[model samples]
Target: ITVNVLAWLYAAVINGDRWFLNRFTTTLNDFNLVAMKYNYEPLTQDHVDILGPLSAQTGIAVLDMCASLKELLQNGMNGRTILGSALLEDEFTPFDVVRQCSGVTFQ
Candidate 1:
């Protein structure tokens, strides 16, 4: 979102047009809107720990990721979603309740 915002700014500069700038310029370039992403509980220490290892040593080898997402999404019972669920323990299923971000201001 930031990149896109900046690209729009650059376009405005290059075009010598201030209208887009005025139209979009606002107090909230990065607005605040609570959105539910990944139906899971608040991320846990274990979540952080596991991701650290996977992102480093294991990497993409452990995941089909972008490619396999469709397989699950393609059907009534997405194959990839079910397969991914196997990896998750009961403690970490769709459990993240809605919570607003604490704050959005730059420090």
Candidate 2:
């Protein structure tokens, strides 16, 4: 999903705002659009600092990147723009795994 959409989902989950779910879905749909523009695969501990614990918490019933996408969405959502880190390779993080980690949801 795109960063903006991820942000929207995060907002909905945290703030219980259903109005933003559609944008989150849209972001998920165009997630690959910025593959080259940004580094989806985060390299270095810095990125891990942000993504590690999140991954650890999520059992990954879905996948790794799926969790990453969810986190990314959260980060974007909470007004954390301009991510400083990410995976070194294109990963598959989805909300299915992302939600497993945190206990925050609207419905």
Evaluate residue 48 in candidate 2 and report its C-alpha lDDT on the 0 to 100 scale. 38
What is the per-residue lDDT of model 2 for residues 1-107, given as tens digits with 9 covering 90 to 100?
A: 33323332332344443322232232323444434345443233343343444445432211234345544544454543322222211232434434553668444
lDDT for model 2: 0.37
User: What's the true lDDT of residue 1 in model 2?
Assistant: 31
Candidate 2: deviation at residue 74, Å? 21
Compose the digit string of candidate 1's lDDT tens values, residues 48-100.
Answer: 34333232322321122211221222232323222134322233211111011
lDDT (0 to 1) per candidate: 0.25, 0.37
Candidate 2 scores a C-alpha RMSD against the true structure in Å of 11.5
Instruction: Quote each prediction's TM-score.
Output: 0.22, 0.24
Worst 10 residues of 1 by lDDT: 93-102
TM-score of model 1 relative to the true fold? 0.22
What is candidate 2's TM-score against the reference?
0.24
